[PDB]
Paper text:
The conserved tyrosine was replaced by phenylalanine at position 191, while the conserved glycine was replaced by serine at position 285 in E53. The unexpected outcome was S285G: most esterases have glycine at position 285; after mutating the serine to the more conserved glycine, only 20–30% of activity was detected. Despite the fact that S285 is adjacent to H284, a residue of the catalytic triad, the crystal structure of E53-S285G did not exhibit obvious relocation of the catalytic triad (2.7Å for H284Nε2 to S162Oγ, and 2.6Å for H284Nδ1 to D254Oδ2) compared with WT E53 (2.9 Å for H284Nε2 to S162Oγ, and 2.6Å for H284Nδ1 to D254Oδ2). Such distance could allow the catalytic process to happen.
To advance the understanding of esterases, we have identified and characterized E53, an alkalophilic esterase from a marine bacterium Erythrobacter longus. Family IV esterases, to which E53 belongs, are widely distributed in microorganisms, plants, and animals, specifically degrade short-chain esters.
Residue numbers in the entry: 4 to 312
The structure:
């Protein structure tokens, strides 16, 4: 069998005990609420921070809600992290990933702006990308409402948010914002299509993210398999910014992350590839229920500090 950490295994056994309906069998509101509840019970509590403020910026469909996290009430110009939550582009919001954002802000000592991007099925592909790109460009412009000056931006996100991370970096690479992407951090991202991958078959059931959920999200979002904004493995990697790709060894979409990191090396780009051993997809948000995942997040943080100099 594949290696599973004991604390990870205990969580998986509890999920199996819970049982219950699939995402597709729930109403959309129920599916979203179930994600809120899982992260509410599984993640470590929020860090206390000097600044936690709701903002918004203009976007192509209307205003995009944002949340700013900063350990400092005032700070000098520097890079700003721009965070896109996971949830298949269907579930998640500013609260499902709130505690993680406070942790990133506390441990990095950099401001974090999370994006409340439009969700499918109500807003299919590419709505999420439109909002993540717009909000990242907005942050990169150092607007007065932000109260911080950005010298560069650092896209980061988990799962669908890691897909968005890569797409945003490619879009800004092609048409720069007011400051560059100085580092991108796609965490267990969807980069290439997982269909047909060995990891999707190996981890299709019993590893938190299921093949059934992947198919549910896909039906809702409707990304075009030939569009690099849906599957950014298809994009131009020759000028990719410095990158940290973090995956999980038990992740059905693990191989998608492997593929992306291999493509960056193939294009001669600087990349840190970290594959956390014995944990699942979503490890960034289960840091109380599976305490060893706090250390996995701390390794990403250390890699980010190193890559930033
Ligand atoms: C209850 C399942 C939680 C998985 C939600 C999540 O952690 O965010 C994801 C985002 C995107 C994809 N995907 O594109 O396959 C999978 C997961």
């Amino acid at each position: 069998t594949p290696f599973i950490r004991p604390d990870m295994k205990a969580f998986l056994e509890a999920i199996a005990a819970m049982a219950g309906p699939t995402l597709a069998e729930m109403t959309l509101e129920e599916a979203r609420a179930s994600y809120v509840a899982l992260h509410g019970m599984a993640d470590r509590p929020a860090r206390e921070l000097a600044v936690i403020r709701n903002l918004s910026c203009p976007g192509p469909a209307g205003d995009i809600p944002l949340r700013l996290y900063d350990a400092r009430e005032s700070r000098e110009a520097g890079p700003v992290i721009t965070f896109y939550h996971g949830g298949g582009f269907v579930i998640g919001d500013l609260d499902t990933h709130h505690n993680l954002c406070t942790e990133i802000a506390a441990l990095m000592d950099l401001p974090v702006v999370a994006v409340d991007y439009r969700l499918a099925p109500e807003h299919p592909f590419p709505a999420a990308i439109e909002d993540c790109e717009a909000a990242t460009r907005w942050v990169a412009s150092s607007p007065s409402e932000l109260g911080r000056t950005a010298s560069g931006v650092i896209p980061i996100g988990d799962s669908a948010g890691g897909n968005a991370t890569i797409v945003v970096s490619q879009l800004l690479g092609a048409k720069p914002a007011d400051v560059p992407v100085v580092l991108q951090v796609p965490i267990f991202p969807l980069a290439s299509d997982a269909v047909g991958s060995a990891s999707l078959e190996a981890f299709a059931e019993g590893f938190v993210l299921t093949k059934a959920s992947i198919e549910f999200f896909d039906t809702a979002y409707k990304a075009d398999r030939a569009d690099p904004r849906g599957f950014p493995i298809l994009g131009d990697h020759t000028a990719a910014p410095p990158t940290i790709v973090a995956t999980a060894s038990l992740d059905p979409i693990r191989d998608s992350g492997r593929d992306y990191a291999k493509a960056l090396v193939e294009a001669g780009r600087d990349v840190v590839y970290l594959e956390m051993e014995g944990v699942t997809h979503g490890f960034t948000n289960i840091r109380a229920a599976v305490p060893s995942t706090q250390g996995d997040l701390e390794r990403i943080i250390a890699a980010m500090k190193m890559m930033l100099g």
